[PDB]
Design an enzyme around this catalytic site. Structure first.
Site, mmCIF file in Angstrom:
data_model
loop_
_atom_site.group_PDB
_atom_site.id
_atom_site.type_symbol
_atom_site.label_atom_id
_atom_site.label_comp_id
_atom_site.label_asym_id
_atom_site.label_seq_id
_atom_site.Cartn_x
_atom_site.Cartn_y
_atom_site.Cartn_z
ATOM 1 N N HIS A 165 0.853 -1.174 0.000
ATOM 2 C CA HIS A 165 0.000 0.000 0.000
ATOM 3 C C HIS A 165 0.909 1.251 0.000
ATOM 4 C CE1 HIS A 165 -3.529 2.410 0.641
ATOM 5 N NE2 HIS A 165 -4.277 1.410 1.075
ATOM 6 N N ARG A 437 14.088 -6.107 -6.492
ATOM 7 C CA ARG A 437 14.209 -5.053 -7.496
ATOM 8 C C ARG A 437 15.229 -4.034 -7.082
ATOM 9 N NH1 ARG A 437 10.209 -0.511 -10.024
ATOM 10 N NH2 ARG A 437 9.933 0.064 -7.828
ATOM 11 N N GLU A 547 11.414 1.890 -18.541
ATOM 12 C CA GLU A 547 10.515 2.919 -18.046
ATOM 13 C C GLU A 547 10.256 4.090 -19.036
ATOM 14 O OE1 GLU A 547 10.932 3.919 -13.977
ATOM 15 O OE2 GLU A 547 12.094 2.129 -13.451
ATOM 16 N N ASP A 584 5.027 4.658 -14.675
ATOM 17 C CA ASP A 584 6.397 5.097 -14.899
ATOM 18 C C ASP A 584 6.512 5.758 -16.260
ATOM 19 O OD1 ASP A 584 7.112 4.005 -12.404
ATOM 20 O OD2 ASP A 584 8.211 2.317 -13.248
ATOM 21 N N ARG A 622 2.559 -1.523 -12.135
ATOM 22 C CA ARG A 622 1.429 -0.681 -11.801
ATOM 23 C C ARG A 622 1.061 0.427 -12.781
ATOM 24 N NH1 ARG A 622 -0.008 2.549 -7.323
ATOM 25 N NH2 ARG A 622 -0.429 4.202 -8.922
ATOM 26 N N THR A 652 0.942 -6.976 -11.302
ATOM 27 C CA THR A 652 0.970 -6.274 -10.039
ATOM 28 C C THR A 652 -0.432 -6.118 -9.539
ATOM 29 O OG1 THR A 652 2.784 -4.944 -10.862
ATOM 30 C CG2 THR A 652 1.570 -4.013 -9.061
ATOM 31 N N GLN A 660 -10.357 -4.071 -2.244
ATOM 32 C CA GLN A 660 -11.461 -4.297 -3.193
ATOM 33 C C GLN A 660 -11.319 -5.668 -3.828
ATOM 34 O OE1 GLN A 660 -14.785 -1.805 -3.664
ATOM 35 N NE2 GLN A 660 -14.054 -2.262 -5.783
ATOM 36 N N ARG A 737 8.755 6.039 1.700
ATOM 37 C CA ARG A 737 10.146 5.929 1.245
ATOM 38 C C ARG A 737 10.519 7.217 0.491
ATOM 39 N NH1 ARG A 737 7.335 5.269 -2.858
ATOM 40 N NH2 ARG A 737 7.974 4.857 -5.005
ATOM 41 N N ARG A 750 9.597 10.206 -8.038
ATOM 42 C CA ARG A 750 9.053 8.890 -8.381
ATOM 43 C C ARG A 750 7.585 8.950 -8.719
ATOM 44 N NH1 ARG A 750 12.836 4.492 -6.885
ATOM 45 N NH2 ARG A 750 11.108 3.263 -7.798
ATOM 46 N N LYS A 812 -13.962 10.811 -10.610
ATOM 47 C CA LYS A 812 -13.466 11.049 -9.269
ATOM 48 C C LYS A 812 -12.795 12.430 -9.150
ATOM 49 C CE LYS A 812 -12.313 6.157 -8.474
ATOM 50 N NZ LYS A 812 -11.150 5.244 -8.600
ATOM 51 N N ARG A 871 -19.456 8.304 -1.990
ATOM 52 C CA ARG A 871 -18.226 8.614 -1.289
ATOM 53 C C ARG A 871 -17.980 10.134 -1.224
ATOM 54 N NH1 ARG A 871 -14.158 5.171 -5.068
ATOM 55 N NH2 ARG A 871 -15.471 3.284 -5.237
ATOM 56 N N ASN A 927 -7.823 3.365 -6.681
ATOM 57 C CA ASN A 927 -6.884 3.463 -7.803
ATOM 58 C C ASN A 927 -7.301 4.525 -8.824
ATOM 59 O OD1 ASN A 927 -9.134 1.783 -8.891
ATOM 60 N ND2 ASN A 927 -7.808 1.847 -10.715
HETATM 61 O O1 LIG Z 1 6.088 3.379 -9.483
HETATM 62 P P1 LIG Z 1 7.184 3.454 -8.425
HETATM 63 O O2 LIG Z 1 7.236 4.824 -7.745
HETATM 64 O O3 LIG Z 1 8.509 2.921 -8.938
HETATM 65 O O4 LIG Z 1 6.767 2.458 -7.187
HETATM 66 C C1 LIG Z 1 6.467 1.044 -7.161
HETATM 67 C C2 LIG Z 1 5.676 0.609 -8.398
HETATM 68 O O5 LIG Z 1 6.523 0.976 -9.510
HETATM 69 C C3 LIG Z 1 6.355 0.462 -10.825
HETATM 70 O O6 LIG Z 1 5.475 1.300 -11.640
HETATM 71 C C4 LIG Z 1 5.974 -1.022 -10.769
HETATM 72 O O7 LIG Z 1 5.532 -1.158 -12.107
HETATM 73 C C5 LIG Z 1 4.994 -1.605 -9.664
HETATM 74 O O8 LIG Z 1 4.986 -3.117 -9.581
HETATM 75 C C6 LIG Z 1 5.214 -0.874 -8.273
HETATM 76 O O9 LIG Z 1 4.067 -0.900 -7.352
#
Ligand SMILES: O=P(O)(O)OC[C@H]1O[C@H](O)[C@H](O)[C@@H](O)[C@@H]1O
Ligand SMILES: O=P(O)(O)OC[C@H]1O[C@H](O)[C@H](O)[C@@H](O)[C@@H]1O
Lengths: 929, 929
Positions: A165, A437, A547, A584, A622, A652, A660, A737, A750, A812, A871, A927
């Site tokens: 999360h 990673r 990326e 990314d 993601r 992911t 959910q 982080r 990030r 949203k 909501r 999301n």
């Molecule tokens: O997107 P970041 O800030 O690198 O953080 C972590 C995420 O990064 C990427 O987009 C990955 O594809 C995911 O598997 C992860 O949850």
């Protein structure tokens, strides 16, 4: 007699209502019970204060009068630190309730019985296909034999990778959420007594309060953050998987396959980043990683252990085959207990029990070794006494199983025993496998230290061709690279030690080594070499994550080169996995251009793997349409480019979606279901390929979109000051982080933070920006494009799925919040810049509508819209509260007359109120990007 | 809506599953208020609500303050507004009664019943016809054949009397439409639209009723033409439905044939245009007219349905018997239109039924012309003068069908029709004639004096008998055209000319009111002979006063001793009794017990002389309650008093409850038939001699108390005249000088019912109970064993209990305070004290804490009506003040009703307000004494 009917009445206004549509009732009851609780605990006075905020937010959500927002401001901003904390808790908690109610509504909503057959039906839980329907479509609409389907399925794998999360909830609090959801579910059942109702009422009332009062103020270690996970699995997935696989069995009956899905077929596999992903995150040390493996191993053994005793009781049978009867005798013979259910010795009179008792002890030992290793570091416990490999644990269960069938009892064998086999086979000795990673530059830093220490120059300074030449040479080197006496920075040591950890631990703990910020062939070889250096017996597969757009454009050349190397072709043994990350890539070039580019990159890399005889798996990071959860995931998966899944899905499951997707048994089941169904269908029923006109227009729009996105985000020098002001991004950055990998700028920031900052604000820039320029330019170049775009939305799954996601986000979104923010937090010189962005919001939204052929957002999806409308008032209150709090934090000299303190009872500051606010909003938004 | 609030405030009045009554009432009331608003304005609507709120608040707590607040309001209204309120509440009552009818209709039967006789006092537990058959067969060793046989010979005659206050055929149908709309609004699988449309349907039909409210007297002819509605509306269809149920019930105990269609199981009769006792409006011409109307309308009913049977009877296969008669009719070579053509012998059943139709039409038209002209040029040949003539062609069709193999079709509408014809004949109801003995004496006295032989009046009974028998065999007429006649004597003699001229199938019995002797009955026989009435009506003495009851056995014995009489009555005698009448003489208690014994004795006497005795139950019984209580009341009758033939009054104030709704209609018919049947095979236990003895003892005391208060106390009549609207009722039939002995019973009962005090029903029970317990405490136990074990006693106490539940001494008290002089108030107080003490003994004996513990559903019905009634009591009381008192005036509120649209009497509109009030209360109170 009736606070509720009124609260129901005033909740209906927000979304007009119908049959099995209980959501408004559910929300009403929950809210009415929650208010009473606020009254008991904090007093009439406060309760009203909370209602007022709600009334204002609701009034606002209907008309959209900026006055209401200000009235709300006057109220919220006039509250002392103490009271604002309470309101923030309250609204933040009514949200979680509203989500439970929605989970429940979604769980029990009726399936449509006759479906159009359009692929759109697969974007919605009520109309999407379950596993049987999918089989049938494949058999009848596509001329596959049952045997062919069964066969496809037998070989299929679906891997769900769980990420943490980005803000994550407590195992206790989960279970309260469950209890509340059940009490609620139970209050709505006919044939229910006045008494049971009364008692369920107080049960409900009580469990909401218990949740509300579980609210202590905090950071927590990766170990705990992960020990979180091992909950959700207990709670739902551990049971879910057998339930689903049994449904697969039933579905196979009904298309005429007269056998069950093999219990060891690895259809479903789970994995995790927790303790694994150290990319831009130095808290994730080697020791962390060692600990999450041992925890995983431990808890898993414990799970098998706490249910074995129930299987043992169930297995009261005495008739067995000889194979078993021998091994039982052996075991009783070799006898001469810490726990208690079976704390006794066991007669060979009941042999199945004898085996399972051994199994239990072995599981207990396996639990204990992992426990001692974890807390001491040594453990005096033989591999003989313990499961080091899943086959060892399956074997006795297969034994029992076979014995039963042989004695004429297959029917019994296909009960709990089967479930247990399936669990063991799905979850192995480590519930999840851990992915590692780290970012490419780190491996470079390490290799550079090595080359320089060897006196041969600087790996960093070398060209790609040189790096490759050197790497291959050393991959067949005849003597180690690394001494104990190599000069190491803390980072290099950290990185090297991670490999020492990978070598020391059993390989069934690990999945892939993902390289963040991959760009080249050398990036992957580098990792291969370090694995060889540490003599890792079963090296993890190396997975580049490309990326930036450029990195995506270069990926094919890189993969081709890899596949050209015999050293590499032979190591990977016919299999390559490549990762992609929508968020990314979209941070680089806009969501639109990233979506399209990723479609093409997958196509090209597929083609390239096909040419070299390589089975290619695409790991969906993601941000996808495919990480939405619910039906939309169903269609998203079917929308993938042809041959990109080919029997192996890896995706992911974003933390902000795990509740959910999994928190309720029915949703858990259907999540698993659609992942399996879609994956299966796709390999036998790809979506249509885009018409060349479409590719061409998509290429044209991509340039314009990327131009707009970059113009605004990177080229415009005012942007970062705007961002820093209009958005809690900086304050977020005093946390999960380090959100800046201290370098400065957006390219440095990030992606999670990027997405999250603008989500808080309801403006969502990262998701839509560039779609508007792209659409506008394509229509203005030629009005016939509108028609083309619409045909694309109607007929091209990729396109549809791409537009639906952005549409959902606009639903949203609320630019008024963005506007309020400008007015409170942004300086006079930057407001027109804001206005300009809001203008782009609107224009983008309107084109998007025109293209989907909708008057209003989500016409296609009233149920989703209803969820959001409900909501919102809660979220709105949090936005406003947040905004003023951000003011008070940023401006030591902004003050207004505080109302005399309102809460009763019978140290905290603004920063605490802000966190509450950041987390309420985040949980209300789920999301987006 | 504001319904849920009106529901909430209605629940308070009576705190479940199929219990919709409160919802029903709530909706109706909420709809009715809107209507008052539209028509008369907010201002008035509130005024109405206020009254309701006050009455309800009063009904809960019983705060006399509330009553006064109500007084202040009601008494402050001008004549115009008070009329409106009086209409409103008087109309909400009728609504509440429709809702209750509906609730009663659809309440669920209890499935397993104790088997106790108490079960038969309640619709939910009482026995239907099948259960009765089964009890008789299994618990009583009767063969199905014996039961079937008993039933085949059983007759049940329901005698309909006129409403003592009676409603319009239009308004009935609105009541029906409203009740159906309501019934329909509560059905699942109902659309938003159908609900919306049913809503406005409902709303509309209430208004249509509310606006049907014109101010007036009406003729016996119309008052009776009323009746011919209720039959149309419900009984006409009810009878076949029930008889078909009998058929089904006979299947299920193994009788493989249907109840014979001509078995006269159910017969109806009427007093309307027949009863002239103390009522000179009921002339001979009246009586002629009600026969002709009856004949007409009945023909019309048969006529309007024949056309539907003709369409249904499309068959062409018939037996020869029929085929002949068809050929004949077509061979022998239209005002209305369905079949306005000639008909092919191709379809013979239709040919017959066409003839039948013409004959029915002619029969209708002759009766129509006779009725309006006095002559009619129409041959007996063309017309049904006798029911056999109408059955014959139907039996023909019926047989033909069975013979052709179509009995199954023959048992459809044809059978229904046969049953209707057989039950209703040519005259839906037969008319009873009633006149008081003294009148026949007056007539005979004129005769004897005119003959020069002295004065019949002066003669002793023995002399009268001797003369009457001599003249009953006289060889020459008594009466010349030349005889001197007062208008009364002429009126009485002309009635006999009317009886002689009209067909005998129009008439039932000649009842002699105030019978006392053998001569009384011979007198009537003689006059019938004088007028050469070919089929004389049977003479039925009605013995009213206690002495008259004590003398009845000697009288009947003497009659049965006379050969002249024994041979005229041909084995059958009917005697009438009247609970209210006898109870006006001696108290309800002593009258109840005396009537038990008299029936026993007269039964015994008839048995000895070989005479089948039928007891005609006049009004006032437990047996005229309607509903379940009737069921037990009938079973409670002394042994052998029914003996296969029941004849009972259906009191006008009970006709709606009994018949106005198809389900209640059916069950009314059902219980009458079942109870009658059971009783002849399963009498109640006979009273233990201790019980007779105590009953005889209590009777004296009760009669003493009753007569002490009513006849002996000289203050009583002035009290009655003041505390009670009795005088004002008496400016309406004449209820010549008075005293209570003179006052008729309906007025007596009605006056004290208006007032909620009900003196005529309980007075004397208290003295009887008190004296029996104070003589010996063991009596209490005896009384309670009697209540538990002796149906008569149980039934007797339940009725009185029901009345106390409809009672409220506060109203009585308010009346004293408003209307009664200071010197008589202690007399009132004393009576109220007796009310309380009587009630409490009655409770102690039934073993109840509160009234109606045995019967929550009934209590709920009463509790819900009450607030409306209370408002009418109060309104009434003040109106009675303003009418009576020159010295009373209070400040009137400025007029409240709006409006867009001489009629003087005594005071300018008060008289009208009082009537409204008298009728609302009466309809809210239904039956009591
Ligand atoms: O997107 P970041 O800030 O690198 O953080 C972590 C995420 O990064 C990427 O987009 C990955 O594809 C995911 O598997 C992860 O949850
Ligand atoms: O006014 P009354 O004397 O009561 O006469 C009318 C009534 O009289 C008796 O009680 C009869 O039993 C009833 O059939 C009738 O309704």
């Amino acid at each position: 007699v009736e606070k509720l009917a009124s609260i129901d009445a005033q909740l209906r206004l927000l979304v007009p209502g119908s049959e099995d549509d209980k959501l408004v009732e559910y929300d009403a009851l929950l809210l009415d019970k929650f208010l009473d609780i606020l009254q008991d605990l904090h007093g009439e006075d406060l309760k009203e204060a909370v209602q007022q905020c709600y009334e204002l937010s609701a009034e606002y959500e209907g008309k959209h009068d900026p006055k209401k927002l200000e009235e709300l401001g006057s109220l919220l901003t006039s509250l002392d630190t103490g009271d604002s904390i309470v309101i923030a808790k309250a609204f933040s908690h009514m949200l979680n309730l509203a989500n439970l109610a929605e989970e429940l509504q979604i769980a029990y909503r009726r399936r449509i019985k006759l479906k159009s057959g359009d692929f759109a039906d697969e974007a919605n839980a009520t109309t999407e296909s379950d596993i049987e329907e999918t089989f049938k479509r494949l058999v009848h609409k596509l001329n596959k034999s049952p045997e062919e389907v069964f066969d496809a399925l037998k070989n299929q794998t679906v891997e769900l990778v769980l990420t943490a999360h980005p803000t994550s909830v407590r195992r206790s609090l989960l279970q309260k959420h469950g209890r509340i959801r059940n009490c609620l579910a139970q209050l709505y059942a006919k044939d229910i007594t006045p008494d049971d109702k009364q008692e369920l009422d107080e049960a409900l009332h009580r469990e909401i309060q218990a949740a509300f009062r579980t609210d202590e103020i905090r950071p927590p270690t990766p170990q705990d953050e992960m020990r979180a996970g091992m909950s959700y699995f207990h709670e739902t997935i551990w049971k879910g998987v057998p339930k689903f696989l049994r449904r697969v069995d039933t579905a196979l009956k009904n298309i005429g396959i007269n056998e069950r899905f093999p219990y060891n077929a690895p259809l479903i596999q789970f994995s995790s980043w927790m303790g694994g992903d150290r990319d831009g995150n130095p808290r994730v040390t080697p020791e962390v990683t060692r600990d999450v493996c041992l925890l995983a191993r431990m808890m898993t053994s414990n799970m098998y252990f706490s249910q074995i005793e129930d299987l043992m009781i169930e297995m009261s049978m005495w008739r067995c085959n000889s194979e078993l009867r021998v091994r039982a005798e052996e075991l009783y013979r070799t006898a001469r207990k810490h726990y208690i259910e079976f704390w006794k010795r066991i007669p060979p009179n009941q042999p199945y029990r004898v085996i399972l008792g051994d199994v239990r002890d072995k599981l207990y030992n396996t639990r204990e070794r992992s426990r001692h290793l974890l807390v001491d570091g040594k453990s005096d416990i033989p591999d003989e006494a313990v499961y080091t490999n899943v086959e060892q644990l399956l074997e006795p269960l297969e034994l029992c199983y076979r014995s039963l069938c042989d004695c004429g009892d297959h029917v019994i064998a296909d009960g709990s025993l089967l479930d247990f086999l399936r669990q063991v086979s799905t979850f192995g000795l480590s519930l999840v496998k851990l992915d590692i990673r780290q970012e490419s530059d780190r491996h470079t830093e390490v290799l550079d230290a090595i080359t320089q220490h060897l006196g041969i120059g600087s790996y960093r300074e070398w060209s790609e061709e040189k790096r490759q030449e050197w790497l291959l040479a050393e991959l067949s080197g005849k003597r180690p690279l690394i001494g104990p006496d190599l000069p190491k920075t803390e980072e290099v040591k950290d990185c090297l030690d991670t490999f020492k950890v990978l070598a020391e631990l059993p390989s069934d703990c690990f999945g892939a080594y993902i390289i963040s910020m991959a760009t080249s062939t050398s990036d992957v070889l580098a990792v291969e070499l370090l694995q060889r250096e540490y003599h890792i017996k079963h090296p993890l597969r190396v997975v580049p994550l490309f990326e930036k757009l450029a990195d995506l454009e270069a990926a094919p050349a890189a993969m081709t080169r890899l596949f050209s190397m015999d050293w590499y072709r032979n190591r990977i043994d016919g299999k390559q996995e490549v990762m992609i990350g929508y968020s990314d890539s979209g941070k680089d070039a806009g969501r639109f251009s990233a979506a399209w580019q990723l479609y093409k990159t997958q196509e090209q890399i597929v083609k390239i793997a096909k040419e070299f005889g390589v089975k290619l798996v695409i790991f969906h990071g993601r941000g996808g349409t495919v990480g939405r959860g619910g039906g939309p995931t169903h269609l998203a998966l079917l929308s993938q480019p042809p041959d990109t899944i080919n029997g192996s899905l890896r995706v992911t499951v974003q933390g902000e979606v795990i509740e959910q997707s999994f928190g309720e048994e029915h949703l858990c089941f259907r999540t698993l279901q659609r992942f399996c169904a879609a994956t299966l269908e796709h390999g036998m029923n790809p979506p249509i390929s885009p018409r060349p006109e479409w590719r061409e227009l998509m290429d044209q729009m991509a340039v314009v979109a990327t131009e707009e996105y970059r113009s605004v985000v990177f080229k415009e020098p005012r942007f970062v000051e705007y961002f820093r002001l209009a958005t809690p991004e900086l304050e977020f950055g005093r946390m999960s982080r380090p959100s800046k990998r201290p370098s400065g700028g957006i390219e440095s920031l990030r992606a999670i933070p990027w997405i999250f900052s603008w989500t808080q604000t309801r403006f969502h820039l990262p998701v839509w920006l560039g779609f508007g320029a792209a659409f506008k330019h394509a229509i203005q170049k030629d009005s016939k494009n509108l028609q083309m775009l619409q045909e694309m939305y109607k007929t091209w799954p990729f396109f549809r799925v791409t537009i639906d996601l952005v549409e959902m986000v606009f639903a949203k979104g609320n630019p008024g919040i963005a506007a309020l923010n400008d007015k409170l937090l942004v300086s006079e010189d930057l407001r027109p810049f804001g206005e300009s962005l809001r203008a782009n919001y609107e224009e983008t939204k309107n084109y998007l509508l025109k293209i989907a052929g909708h008057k209003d957002l989500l016409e296609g999806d009233p149920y989703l819209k209803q969820g959001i409308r409900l909501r919102d008032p809660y979220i709105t209150t949090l936005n406003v509260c947040q905004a003023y709090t951000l003011k008070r934090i940023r401006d030591p000299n902004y003050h207004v007359t505080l109302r005399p303190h309102i809460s009763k009872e019978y140290a905290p500051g603004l920063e605490d109120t802000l966190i509450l606010t950041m987390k309420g909003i985040a949980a209300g938004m789920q999301n987006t990007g």
